[PDB]
């Protein structure tokens, strides 16, 4: 875990998530996908304590999938984000809290608008044009403050994302073995294979 | 009404005796024990021709060395089998060995009387538990909802039980081969069954030390049925 | 009649019919005999089979190295009670490094059976037991009934036609009590006692079941070819 | 041991009747008459003090009970069932309201809580319904004065004026003739005493009649001074002397 | 807690509460399942004593348990929701631990186990519901159709019907369904299903529901006009 | 603060032959620099030709042996006087020990 | 023991019916009639109060019509006390959903859960079922305007127009006759009152014996308004349609 | 007719088990009486010891609940003792929780509320007893409060309980008509006990020896029972007047 | 009717028929007695010798509670044991909290409340025993008799079982003839006689006598069984009186 980014543009939400899984002085894997599809138009990336991350991601995934089957309907990104926030808000006062930070990128089909939510392990939710968790934000936020425009295309958003990854690869201490990039729009979720 | 765990004036538990009547309504199941193995056979009894008969699962594996056949309210047997399987595997985990067939049966029979006012009623199903262990060799047990189990050389349960048991009385001897026992189950099943016996409405199985518990294919049983008919016509 | 629906109800004459119906299950059970001298205590049990293809229902259960019983009635209830005895015998050993007295064994069974006769929902035990044992005060023989009543005896018998063996032992009392330091002769007396309860059937090799405990003899059960000596 | 009665003792009969509720209402019918009348500037509740024995001190037995400083209750039916309901009603006013909002509940909501308790005795395991009908009079800032009736079923209805118990049928007819929407509190007390005389048979005075009002705030009954917003209880029980004064000009 | 043993044996060896639950199933609207060569079709009756209904929002008779398995039923409607909910939860729980969706056999075995538990648990009555569970196992093109009932027994069927007048439609299917050659196409399977319901239903208007399930989570419900075309076609061939 | 463990010292040794096996152990019991007993046995015959010793903290060692001896007893009751094989005894003891994984028996056990 | 006195509320008849559910429905058939009519631009709820007394306070009274949230209301038919237990549960459930998802609860979801509660009382617990039938009238952004009913069995269904309580047979026939799909709210108001006026057991239908409510999008732009009619407003609407 | 076996309503709105519990009250065939003085409250009860083998000192239906409160029971002794033990526990707990001695009338209410529960809850039967509580309350003065199986309770100027209760009741009624006051206008408790015995003798029409009576007296800060000799001394005083 | 089918149900009389039915079971049982004496109490019981096969002196019916209380009962023997087991728990918790051994009157109420509790619910059965018990405490000697209803009183002499009326009559004579008091050693001898006299109502089977006693002087305030020479002496005294 470590680097998870998110950028909301005109017609889509783009999530970038590092591929490295490190334990001790060994990079155990360099192709790890730190994300789960909660519903056809909602994607959640995650980062934090080992084990907790996936266990939480999959638990949320199961619940949203259960809801979808029960009501034969897809929950809005806003609704999913609120559900996730509450689960974390419960967790923090538990015996052993989930130490997991997430980004929820979704496309609301009723509003025809992309939405990006940033939620930390405390259950602190914020809707943002761009978001990051961990040390990443200390570089990317200022970079995006400068280069981001609200009316950008998906292609422009990917170039803007490339600029972030380049900066992180230059100034971050750890080798995070690149990122997996996924786009969330009106047509659902797809992965960019060449990044 | 009246209590579930009530004794009759003759000194029997009403509910246990009534569950025995339910088992008499069930389909026939036969077991025969030999020195070469133990054979288990059942009547499938499909309620309609549209029902896919191969989905009727009345013979069941508990462990590699223990098999089980059922008769009566077969839905009730699911939790009994589950318990048997867990008991067998759990014993292997705790002791690094196979569990004795008698010990397994005893564990299943402990559930039987755990009912009252625990579950609400006794089981409505009887089990034939067949297996092998190193100590007492090939064994066949009849487990009832009374909590009682008897070892048998051969045993029939279900609707055609009393007629089949009398037939097993004459036919069984201590030097039966496995092949002889297979035919004997098929013979006796064909006698007590309503519909005509074939590979689709009857199922065979066995447990041997070497190969463990095996349910026979419909192709294999069909050849044993054909072998049986030829031998009866031959004299 | 109207007062036999459950164990919590007394009859107008002060009877507990469910307890009496449980007592009736014992009378249906196969005969078993108990007797002792001053050195040894012996259980002799007639085992019963479903048919010629079936095995013979095991009647005798070991509780500890120095104690055990024979049963007559519902076998699962005997398994529950014998298990309880095993635990109580074992508790006495682990905690106090003390072999459980046969008298206390009886007291514990009495109190366990009683609780089932005073509460709604439950039922009485449907089995009678004959407990033998050798403890610090010599050989013992107990008779347990599921009413709760436990009784210490020189000899007794329970089950179907148990009156025949019980009469014999009542005559033989003076003889068998002084069979000290001789196991085989005390068993012979027990085998002759149970024979008085036989009708049409006789004692065969896989029919008879004998158990013995004594001064220098742990509780051991004899079945199969080991009892051929006494036929 | 233990409560084995975990099943309903009140069930639907083939005709659709809930037997125990009907029978509870029959018990209420047998009970002594009580009534309530709503005025423009107050509410009055009244009942007869049926003495079990002349040696008994009827002052110690209070049929009209304060629930909150602005809410009072009276009943017809089984007294013991009423007494415990008053205990539970007083407590629920604190636990489910005052300890949360820092103020007393409005009449309608306290009534609602009492109704809930009585409904549960109609459905819960191993219990019979309460054998009483309550008349609850009260005041609150935003609803003003109000009067409610609560039946064994747990149903409650708001009334301008009504009566329950022994001679309720005749008493309700009497109240229909006399009641108007311009009644002052003193006029309602006068009518209450007239209505009650019809049902009472023996002695009719301040010692055999129990009567309380929900009217103006009573600073003299508050017990302390210094807080301007706290002006005292609107519930006041009329004294034996105060009743007799009005019985002369009857 | 309420402990009473409601489901108990009778002198003749019957559990009346389980058998009375079957009567509730017999009262329920007819439901039929027919599996073809490459598909399964679930047909369902809807009683026409209810006009002024709102079919948009009214609970549909066929329910999706997962994207690849469906469940229809006959009997008490309120009871069916409880089974469907439990099944749906177990479906997601199976995906979570095994990392693979349920097989139709497994899902059926679970639902049947729940029904059985309610026949020997204290304080509860059995489910007055029999179900038809149909679908396709993951990465498998062999059609699956299973039936469950209040007792807890379950089994696989080439074709089967449950509910009121089911014995009439079972009679129809028994002669019209060939084991050696099942309905080769979707059209053939739907037609045979509609035909079988037309023996019992009344009118082929808003009384018949049809749901077609195909491999790889391909489930679609037919509309009124689509079903009406089968009804119109069958009646014209009948007049002969 | 109360310390629930102690060290009773001693040492044990087991060797296996072709048709035999030995399990030896010194008879000294100690706490700190004092001797408690010069003859306190800690190698026991547990039945079914199994000898056992649990060396380290004697209170935990005696408890474990006691439990295993009791395990042998109940194995007989529950499985028709079957002899507990050495391999089966080993696996049983694993479970006894691991049952107290989060409050261990401070012993090195040999059978 | 106590077995002797157990009614066994959650069992099947030999015919496969639930005794207590059937008898609860028999109870509900004597309760005051409640009608729900769904129009294209709103929903009407109309209900007849049970034999009113002249000294009953009418304006500060609530017997038939209850508010569950800002978008959903119910009409009651049966035991009021039972209905209030279920209504508070429903009100809480709606707030739980809103707290969890930050969205108003879809009508069906609320209905299903309330119906599931009723179902439980018929299958386990040994308690009597709730002697209540609801008409749910509500709106959400998925299905728009919706009418549902639930009964003591825990079974619920959707409707264009429906009646519960007394004389449903006669009421349903009249609704089935005059109802059509392109109907407006003001027309549905008139239909609801006309149906009650003919099916009533009373001599004449008056304002004091009625509860009335509408759920329109008659607020300002793309938002729903609940209107629980006041006594004077029922008096006026009764004159306007020419019943009095 | 199972509505007569448990505490549920009959068609005419009655609880038969409660009514039958009232009849259990008189099973002992003992009459009790309670009156108030200026400074005291006196309670007296008949004492009948039929068996010669009984230890007469252990035969009692009067109980010392707390230091200040006394209680006499009309009904079978098992239920009487059940009620006594509970009342003792309640009075002790009250003092611990609220820091002052439980008043007579409050204990009566508490025991009455418990009795009420048995009339509503099915698994619990009512106690077949009538509990008469007496004290000299520090706020209300001399106090008599009585409880029954229905859960009813009320204060009394004076009271009587038992088979011949009505004869005793009217006897007392006529006295208070005559005296025109709520109590026995007497200084010492000795003479109030004498009044109680005198008016019981007149009402019942029987003469009493020292062993035929049982007396309890409540004064400020203590309730106590009288011995046989204390009663004998009291009987002598009546006879010599 | 049906008022007698369920425990804790009042009949129209105000009676609990189930308790009265339990009394019948007590009346069916063997005879047991209790005699209060100068500085203690004596207990005795009839043991019917059903068969020659019964081991003499080895079916003990009298039970001890704590170290100073003796209990004996007639009726359903198991029910009596259950009551004693409770008595022992009650006496143990009293001594645990209050240090001093439980007084007899205190102990009497503990059993009384427990037995009475078994008349409050239909889910339990009343006790099928009348229990005679007592001992020596700080206030001296106490004898009690407890019945199925929960009713108990203190006694000068007590008797219950099949021969209760015969024993009661004999007990009443002792109270009359010895107003100053009866000694402990005398009471043991008298107890033997009264059991032998009460055996006339159960004379088919012959019986075995069993006696126990608590006395401040003779047993030092502790409960002991009468055995050996003192037992045979009491048997001979009884044998001489019947002839
Ligand atoms: Cl209270
Ligand atoms: Mg009661």
Q: Does E10 touch chain G (CB under 8 A)?
A: no
| Distance (Å, whole) CA A192 – CA A12 | 14
**H109 C-alpha vs ligand 1 centroid, how far in Å?**
7
- Dihedral sign for Cα atoms in the order D94, D96, D98, D102: positive
Name the β-bridge partners of I47. Answer: I208
Contact assessment for residue H122 and residue I8, using Cβ atoms and an 8 Å cutoff: no
In chain C, DSSP finds a helix count (H) and a strand count (E) of 5, 10
Q: B123-143 burial by CB neighbour count: b if 16+ within 10 A, else e? A: bbbbbbbbbbbeeeebbbbbb
Question: H55–I112: do the CB atoms touch at under 8 Å?
Answer: no
A97: DSSP letter: -
Q: Which of D20, I9, C8 is nearest to H5 (CA)?
A: I9
In which domain, by residue range, is H8 found? 1-241
Structure tokens at D201: 């048979």
| Distance (Å, whole) CA B128 – CA B104 | 12
User: How many Cβ atoms are within 10 Å of E98's Cβ, its own excluded?
Assistant: 10
Q: Which residue has the tokens 């998925």?
A: G142
CATH of the domain at H63: 3.60.20.10
Q: Is I30 a catalytic residue?
A: yes
Q: Does B110 touch chain F (CB under 8 A)?
A: no
Resolution in angstroms, to 1 decimal, for this deposition? 2.7
Number of domains composing chain A: 1
| Distance (Å, whole) CA B55 – CA A99 | 47
Contact assessment for residue E191 and residue E230, using Cβ atoms and an 8 Å cutoff: yes
Contact assessment for residue C139 and residue C66, using Cβ atoms and an 8 Å cutoff: no
Tell how strand A35-39 and strand A42-48 pair up.
antiparallel
Nearest CA distance, G221 vs chain H (angstrom):
56
Chains B and A touch, using 3 or more CB pairs below 8 Å: no
Q: How far is CA I9 from the centre of its chain?
A: 28
Interior CA angle at F7 toward F1 and F12, to 5°?
Answer: 160
| Distance (Å, whole) CA C90 – CA D20 | 56
Q: Does E206 touch chain A (CB under 8 A)?
A: no
Cα-only R_g, chain E:
18
E135's CB contacts (< 8 A; 6+ apart) are E40, E65, E66, E68, E69, E70, E104, E107, E144, E213
E-only strand ranges, H118-238: 130-137, 141-147, 153-156, 158-161, 213-219, 222-225
| Distance (Å, whole) CA D58 – CA D63 | 10
In which domain, by residue range, is I235 found? 1-243
| Domain G1-244, CATH | 3.60.20.10
Interior CA angle at A20 toward A17 and A25, to 5°?
Answer: 150
Mutate to test the interface with C, among I22, I29, I51 (most CBs of C within 10 A): I51
Name the β-bridge partners of D149. Answer: D135, D157
Contact assessment for residue G73 and residue G148, using Cβ atoms and an 8 Å cutoff: no
C-alpha distances out from residue B168 to B43, B153, D63, Å: 16, 9, 84
Question: H81–I150: do the CB atoms touch at under 8 Å?
Answer: yes
Chains G and A touch, using 3 or more CB pairs below 8 Å: yes
For chain G, domain boundaries: 1-244
H86-90 own/partner pairs: CB under 8 Å, 24+ apart: H86/H111, H86/H114, H87/H63, H87/H111, H87/H131, H87/H133, H88/H63
| Distance (Å, whole) CA A170 – CA F85 | 65
Contact assessment for residue G19 and residue G133, using Cβ atoms and an 8 Å cutoff: no
User: How many Cβ atoms are within 10 Å of H141's Cβ, its own excluded?
Assistant: 15
Q: Following CA atoms A135, A141, A143, A146 in sequence, which dihedral angle do they give, to the nearest 10 degrees?
A: -170
| Region at E52 (left for phi over 0; alpha for psi -120 to 50; beta for the rest) | left
Nearest CA distance, D66 vs chain G (angstrom):
23
Q: How far is CA E88 from the centre of its chain?
A: 15
Q: Which of G190, G156, G191, G193 is nearest to G175 (CA)?
A: G191
Structure tokens at C49: 């089979």
C-alpha distances out from residue I51 to A173, B147, I54, Å: 97, 35, 6
Which residue numbers come right before each break in chain D (C to N over 2.5 Å)?
none
User: How many Cβ atoms are within 10 Å of A74's Cβ, its own excluded?
Assistant: 20
Name the β-bridge partners of F99. Answer: none
CATH of the domain at E109: 3.60.20.10
| Distance (Å, whole) CA B134 – CA B104 | 14
Structure tokens at B14: 């009403």
C174's CB contacts (< 8 A; 6+ apart) are none
Please return the burial class of G39, using the count of CB atoms within 10 Å of its CB with bins 0-12, 13-18 and 19+. Answer: buried
What 3-state DSSP class applies to C42? Answer: strand
Q: Which residue has the tokens 């304080």?
A: E123
Nearest to D131 among H11, H13, H173 (CB): H13
Nearest CA distance, H39 vs chain I (angstrom):
33
* Helix or strand holding residue F66 (H, E): helix F58-78
| Distance (Å, whole) CA C147 – CA C16 | 9
CATH of the domain at A36: 3.60.20.10
C-alpha distances out from residue I152 to G172, H23, H75, I215, Å: 71, 21, 14, 22
Q: Which of D38, D36, D44, D234 is nearest to D140 (CA)?
A: D234
Which residue numbers come right before each break in chain G (C to N over 2.5 Å)?
none
Please return the burial class of I28, using the count of CB atoms within 10 Å of its CB with bins 0-12, 13-18 and 19+. Answer: middle
F94's CB contacts (< 8 A; 6+ apart) are none
- What are the backbone angles phi and psi of residue C131, rounded to the nearest 5°? -95, 125
- In chain D the domains, ranked by start, together with CATH numbers, are 1-250 (3.60.20.10)
Q: Following CA atoms E177, E178, E184, E187 in sequence, which dihedral angle do they give, to the nearest 10 degrees?
A: -20
What is the edge-to-edge ordering of all strands in the sheet holding C150-152? C60-64, C67-73, C127-135, C138-144, C150-152
Name the active-site residue from I1, I30, I31, I131.
Answer: I30
Please return the burial class of A23, using the count of CB atoms within 10 Å of its CB with bins 0-12, 13-18 and 19+. Answer: exposed
In chain G, residues with a C-beta closer than 8 Å to the C-beta of H5 are 5
Nearest CA distance, G194 vs chain C (angstrom):
59
Structure tokens at A39: 């519903």
How would DSSP label each residue in G90-117? HHHHHHHHHHHHSSPPPHHHHHHHHHHH
- Please report which ligand is nearest the Cα atom of H16: 2
What 3-state DSSP class applies to B41? Answer: strand
CATH of the domain at I208: 3.60.20.10
| Distance (Å, whole) CA C228 – CA H46 | 79
Fold exhibited by the domain B1-235: 3.60.20
What 3-state DSSP class applies to D45? Answer: strand
User: How many Cβ atoms are within 10 Å of B82's Cβ, its own excluded?
Assistant: 12
Contact assessment for residue I69 and residue I135, using Cβ atoms and an 8 Å cutoff: yes
Q: How far is CA G58 from the centre of its chain?
A: 19
| Distance (Å, whole) CA D178 – CA D200 | 19
Please return the burial class of D227, using the count of CB atoms within 10 Å of its CB with bins 0-12, 13-18 and 19+. Answer: exposed
Q: Does E167 touch chain B (CB under 8 A)?
A: no
| Distance (Å, whole) CA G15 – CA I102 | 64
- In chain C the domains, ranked by start, together with CATH numbers, are 1-231 (3.60.20.10)
Chain G's closest residue to I121, CA to CA, is: G1
Mutate to test the interface with B, among C53, C56, C80, C81 (most CBs of B within 10 A): C53
Q: How far is CA B16 from the centre of its chain?
A: 19
In chain B, residues with a C-beta closer than 8 Å to the C-beta of G2 are none
Q: Which of G215, G211, G196 is nearest to G146 (CA)?
A: G215
Structure tokens at H84: 């006594």
Please return the burial class of I181, using the count of CB atoms within 10 Å of its CB with bins 0-12, 13-18 and 19+. Answer: exposed
How would DSSP label each residue in I175-214? HHH-SS---HHHHHHHHHHHHHHHGGGG-SS-EEEEEEEE
* Helix or strand holding residue H46 (H, E): strand H41-46
Structure tokens at D39: 């005025």
E-only strand ranges, chain I: 32-37, 40-48, 63-65, 69-75, 129-137, 140-146, 152-154, 157-160, 207-215, 223-225
The number of CA neighbours under 13 Å toward the Cβ of B116 is 15
Please return the burial class of C174, using the count of CB atoms within 10 Å of its CB with bins 0-12, 13-18 and 19+. Answer: exposed
Structure tokens at G185: 């709210």
| Distance (Å, whole) CA E146 – CA F36 | 73
Question: B103–F95: do the CB atoms touch at under 8 Å?
Answer: no
G49: DSSP letter: P
Q: Does C200 touch chain B (CB under 8 A)?
A: no
C-alpha distances out from residue D244 to B29, C54, D74, D248, E61, Å: 93, 97, 21, 7, 73
What is the edge-to-edge ordering of all strands in the sheet holding D43-48? D161-164, D34-38, D43-48, D209-214, D235-237
How would DSSP label each residue in I70-85? EEEEEE-HHHHHHHHH
């Amino acid at each position: 875990m470590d680097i998870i980014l998110g950028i909301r543009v005109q017609d889509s939400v783009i999530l970038a998530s590092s591929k490295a899984v490190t334990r001790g002085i060994s990079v155990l894997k360099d192709s790890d996908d730190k994300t789960r599809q909660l519903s056809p138009h909602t994607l959640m990336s995650f980062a934090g304590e080992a084990g907790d991350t996936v266990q939480f991601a999959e638990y949320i995934q199961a619940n949203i999938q259960l809801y979808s089957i029960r009501e034969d309907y897809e929950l809005s990104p806003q609704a999913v984000s609120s559900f996730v926030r509450q689960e974390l808000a419960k967790s923090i006062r538990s015996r052993r809290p989930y130490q997991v930070n997430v980004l929820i990128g979704g496309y609301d089909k009723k509003k025809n608008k992309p939405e990006l939510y940033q939620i930390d392990y405390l259950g602190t939710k914020v809707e943002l044009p761009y978001g990051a968790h961990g040390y990443s934000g200390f570089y990317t936020f200022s970079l995006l403050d400068h280069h981001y425009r609200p009316d950008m295309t998906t292609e422009e958003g990917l170039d803007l994302l490339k600029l972030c990854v380049q900066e992180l690869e230059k100034r971050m201490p750890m080798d995070f073995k690149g990122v997996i990039v996924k786009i969330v729009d009106k047509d659902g979720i797809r992965q960019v294979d060449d990044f | 009404d009246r209590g579930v765990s009530t004794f009759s004036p003759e000194g029997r538990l009403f509910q246990v005796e009534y569950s025995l009547e339910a088992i008499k309504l069930g389909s026939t199941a036969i077991g025969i024990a030999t020195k070469e193995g133990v054979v288990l056979g059942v009547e499938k009894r499909a309620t309609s021709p549209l029902l896919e008969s191969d989905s009727i699962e009345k013979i069941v594996e508990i462990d590699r060395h223990i098999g089980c056949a059922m008769s009566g309210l077969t839905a009730d047997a699911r939790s009994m089998i589950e318990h048997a399987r867990t008991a067998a595997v759990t014993h292997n985990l705790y002791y690094d060995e196979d569990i004795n067939v008698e010990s397994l049966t005893q564990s299943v029979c402990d559930l039987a009387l755990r009912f009252g006012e625990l579950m609400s009623r006794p089981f409505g199903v009887a089990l034939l538990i067949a297996g092998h262990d190193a100590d007492d060799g090939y064994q066949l047990f009849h487990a009832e909802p009374s909590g009682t189990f008897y070892r048998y050389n051969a045993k029939a349960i279900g609707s055609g039980s009393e007629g089949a048991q009398a037939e097993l009385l004459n036919e069984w001897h201590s030097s039966l081969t496995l092949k002889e026992a297979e035919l004997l189950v098929l013979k006796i099943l064909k006698q007590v069954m309503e519909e005509k016996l074939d590979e689709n409405n009857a199922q065979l199985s066995c447990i041997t030390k070497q190969d463990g518990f095996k349910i026979y294919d419909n192709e294999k049983t069909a050849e044993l049925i054909k072998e049986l008919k030829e031998k009866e016509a031959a004299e | 009649n109207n007062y036999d629906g459950d164990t919590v109800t007394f009859s107008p004459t002060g009877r507990l019919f469910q307890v009496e119906y449980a007592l009736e299950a014992i009378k249906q059970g196969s005969v078993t005999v108990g007797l002792r001298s001053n050195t040894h205590a012996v259980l002799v049990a007639l085992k019963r089979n479903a048919d010629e293809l079936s095995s013979y229902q095991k009647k005798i259960i070991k509780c500890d190295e120095h104690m055990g019983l024979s049963l007559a009635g519902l076998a699962p209830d005997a398994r529950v009670l014998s298990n309880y005895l095993r635990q109580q015998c074992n508790y006495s050993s682990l905690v106090f490094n003390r072999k459980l007295a046969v008298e206390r064994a009886g007291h514990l069974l009495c109190d366990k059976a009683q609780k089932n006769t005073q509460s709604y929902g439950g039922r009485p035990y449907g089995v009678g037991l004959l407990i033998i044992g050798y403890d610090k005060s010599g050989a013992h023989l107990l008779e347990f009934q599921p009413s709760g009543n436990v009784t210490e005896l020189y000899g007794t018998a329970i089950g179907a036609r148990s009156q025949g063996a019980k009469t014999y032992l009542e005559r033989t009392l003076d003889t068998f009590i002084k069979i000290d330091g001789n196991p085989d002769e005390l068993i012979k007396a027990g085998v002759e006692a149970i024979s008085q309860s036989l009708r049409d059937e006789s004692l065969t090799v896989d029919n008879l079941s004998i158990a013995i405990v004594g001064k220098d003899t742990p509780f051991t059960i004899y079945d199969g070819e080991a009892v051929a000596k006494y036929i | 041991m233990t409560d084995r009665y975990s099943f309903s003792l009140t069930t639907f009969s083939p005709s659709g009747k809930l037997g125990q509720i009907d029978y509870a209402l029959t018990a209420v019918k047998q009970g002594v008459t009580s009534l309530g009348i709503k005025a423009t500037n107050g509410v009055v509740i009244a009942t007869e003090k049926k003495s079990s024995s002349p040696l008994a001190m009827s002052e110690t037995l209070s049929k009209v009970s304060l629930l909150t400083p602005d809410i009072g209750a009276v009943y017809s039916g089984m007294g013991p069932d009423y007494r415990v309901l008053v205990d539970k009603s007083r407590k629920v006013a604190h636990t489910s309201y005052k300890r949360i909002y820092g103020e007393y509940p409005p009449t309608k909501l306290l009534v609602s809580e009492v109704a809930k308790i009585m409904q549960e005795a109609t459905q819960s395991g191993g219990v019979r319904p309460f054998g009483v009908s309550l008349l609850i009079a009260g005041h609150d800032e935003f609803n003003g004065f109000s009067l409610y009736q609560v039946d064994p079923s747990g149903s409650y209805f708001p009334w301008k004026a009504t009566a329950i118990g022994k001679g309720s049928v005749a008493a309700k007819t009497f109240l229909e003739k006399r009641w108007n929407d311009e009644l002052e509190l003193e006029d309602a007390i006068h009518i209450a005493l007239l209505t009650l005389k019809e049902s009472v048979e023996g002695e009719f005075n301040g010692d055999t009649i129990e009567l309380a009002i929900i009217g103006d705030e009573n600073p003299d009954l508050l017990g302390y001074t210094g807080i301007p917003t706290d002006k005292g209880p609107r519930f006041r029980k009329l004294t034996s002397q105060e009743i007799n004064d009005r019985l002369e000009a009857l | 807690g309420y402990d009473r043993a409601l489901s108990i044996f009778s002198p003749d060896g019957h559990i009346f509460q389980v058998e009375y639950a079957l009567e509730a199933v017999k009262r329920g609207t007819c439901a039929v399942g027919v599996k073809g060569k490459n598909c399964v079709v679930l047909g369902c009756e809807r009683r026409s004593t209810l006009k002024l209904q709102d079919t948009r929002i009214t609970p549909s008779k066929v329910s999706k348990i997962d994207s690849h398995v469906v469940l229809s039923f006959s009997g008490l409607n309120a009871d069916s929701r409880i089974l469907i909910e439990k099944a749906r939860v177990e479906a997601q729980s199976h995906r979570l631990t095994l990392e693979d969706p349920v097989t139709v056999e497994y899902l059926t075995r679970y639902v049947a186990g729940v029904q059985q538990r309610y026949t020997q648990s204290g304080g509860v009555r059995p489910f007055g519901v029999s179900t038809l569970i149909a679908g396709f196992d993951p990465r498998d093109d062999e059609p699956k159709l299973y039936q469950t009932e209040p007792s807890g027994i379950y089994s696989s069927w080439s074709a089967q019907t449950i509910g009121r007048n089911s014995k009439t439609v079972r009679e129809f299917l028994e002669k019209n369904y060939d084991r050696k050659e099942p309905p080769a196409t979707v059209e053939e399977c739907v037609k045979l299903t509609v035909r079988s319901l037309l023996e019992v239903v009344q009118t082929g208007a808003k009384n018949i529901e049809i749901t077609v399930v195909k491999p790889d989570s391909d489930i679609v419900a037919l509309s009124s006009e689509e079903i009406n075309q089968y009804v119109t076609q069958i009646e014209q061939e009948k007049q002969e | 603060q109360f310390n629930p463990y102690g060290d009773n010292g001693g040492t044990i040794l087991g060797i296996a032959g072709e048709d035999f096996a030995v399990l030896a152990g010194d008879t000294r019991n100690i706490t700190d620099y004092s001797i408690n007993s010069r003859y306190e046995p800690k190698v026991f015959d547990c039945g079914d030709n199994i000898v056992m010793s649990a060396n380290g903290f004697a209170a935990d060692g005696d408890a474990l042996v006691k439990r295993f001896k009791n395990s042998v007893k109940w194995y007989h009751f529950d499985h028709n006087d079957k002899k507990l094989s050495i391999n089966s005894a080993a696996r049983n003891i694993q479970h006894l020990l691991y049952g107290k994984r989060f409050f261990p028996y401070y012993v090195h056990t040999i059978i | 023991g106590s077995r002797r006195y157990d009614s066994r509320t959650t069992i099947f008849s030999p015919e496969g019916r639930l005794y207590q559910v059937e008898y609860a429905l028999e109870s509900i058939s004597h309760a005051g009639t409640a009608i729900g009519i769904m129009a294209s631009d709103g929903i009407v709820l109309a209900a007849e109060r049970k034999v009113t007394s002249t000294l009953l306070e009418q304006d500060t009274s609530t017997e038939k019509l209850y508010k569950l949230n800002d978008k959903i209301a119910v009409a009651v038919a049966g035991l009021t006390a039972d209905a209030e237990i279920l209504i508070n549960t429903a009100r809480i459930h709606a707030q739980n959903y809103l707290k969890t998802y930050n969205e108003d609860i879809p009508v069906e979801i609320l209905v299903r859960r309330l119906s599931d509660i009723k179902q439980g009382y018929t299958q386990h617990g040994g308690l009597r079922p709730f002697g209540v039938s609801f008409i749910y009238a509500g709106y959400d952004d998925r299905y728009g305007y919706q009418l549902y009913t639930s009964n003591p069995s825990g079974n619920y269904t959707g409707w264009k127009a429906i009646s519960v309580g007394a004389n449903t047979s006669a009421a349903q026939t009249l609704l089935q006759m005059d109802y059509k799909d392109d109907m407006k709210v003001d027309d549905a108001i008139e239909l609801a009152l006309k149906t009650l006026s003919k099916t009533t057991d009373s001599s004449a239908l008056t304002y004091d014996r009625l509860e009335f409510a509408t759920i329109r999008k008659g607020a300002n732009d793309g938002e729903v308004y609940q209107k629980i009619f006041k006594p004077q407003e029922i008096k006026d609407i009764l004159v306007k349609t020419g019943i009095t | 007719g199972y509505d007569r076996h448990i505490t549920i309503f009959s068609p005419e709105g009655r609880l038969y088990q409660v009514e039958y519990a009232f009849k259990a009250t008189n099973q002992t065939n003992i009459n009790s009486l309670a009156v108030r003085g200026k400074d005291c409250t006196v309670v007296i009860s008949q004492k009948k010891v039929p068996d010669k083998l009984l230890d007469p000192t252990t035969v009692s239906y009067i109980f010392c609940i707390s230091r200040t409160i006394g209680m006499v029971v009309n009904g079978p002794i098992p239920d009487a003792r059940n009620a006594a033990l509970r009342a003792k526990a309640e009075a002790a707990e009250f003092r611990y929780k609220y820091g002052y001695d439980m008043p007579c009338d409050v204990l009566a209410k508490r025991m009455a509320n418990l009795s009420q529960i048995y009339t509503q809850r099915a698994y619990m039967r009512p106690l077949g007893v009538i509990l008469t509580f007496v004290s000299v309350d520090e706020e209300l003065g001399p106090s008599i409060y009585k409880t029954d199986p229905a859960g009813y309770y009320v204060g009394y100027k004076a009271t009587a309980t038992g088979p011949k209760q009505q004869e005793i009741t009217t006897n007392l009624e006529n006295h208070f008509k005559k005296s025109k006051i709520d109590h026995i206008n007497e200084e010492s408790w000795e003479k109030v006990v004498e009044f109680a015995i005198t008016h019981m003798i007149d009402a019942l029409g029987t003469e009493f020896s020292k062993n035929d009576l049982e007396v309890g007296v409540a004064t400020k800060d203590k309730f106590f029972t009288l011995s046989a000799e204390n009663i004998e001394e009291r009987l002598v005083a009546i006879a010599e007047q | 009717t049906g008022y007698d089918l369920s425990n804790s149900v009042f009949s129209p009389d105000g009676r609990n028929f189930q308790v009265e039915y339990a009394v019948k079971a007590v009346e069916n049982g063997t005879t047991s007695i209790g005699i209060k004496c100068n500085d203690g109490v004596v207990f005795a019981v009839e043991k019917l010798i059903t068969s020659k096969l019964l081991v003499p002196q080895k079916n003990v019916k009298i039970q001890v509670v704590d170290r100073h209380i003796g209990c004996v009962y007639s009726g359903l023997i198991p029910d009596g044991r259950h009551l004693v087991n409770r008595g022992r728990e009650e006496a143990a918790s009293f001594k645990k909290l209050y240090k001093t051994p439980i007084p007899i009157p205190a102990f009497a109420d503990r059993l009384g409340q427990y037995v009475q509790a078994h008349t409050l619910y239909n889910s339990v059965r009343p006790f099928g025993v009348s229990t005679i018990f007592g001992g020596v405490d700080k206030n001296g000697a106490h004898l009690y008799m407890l019945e199925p209803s929960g009713s108990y009183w203190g006694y000068k002499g007590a008797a219950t079982g099949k021969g209760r009326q015969s024993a009661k009559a004999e007990l009443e004579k002792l109270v009359d003839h010895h107003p100053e008091g009866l000694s402990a050693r005398e009471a043991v001898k008298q107890a033997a006689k009264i059991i032998y006299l009460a055996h006339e109502d159960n004379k088919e089977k012959d019986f075995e006598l069993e006696i126990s006693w608590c006395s401040l002087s003779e047993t030092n305030g502790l409960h002991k069984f009468v055995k050996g020479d003192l037992l045979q002496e009491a048997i001979d005294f009884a044998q001489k009186e019947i002839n």
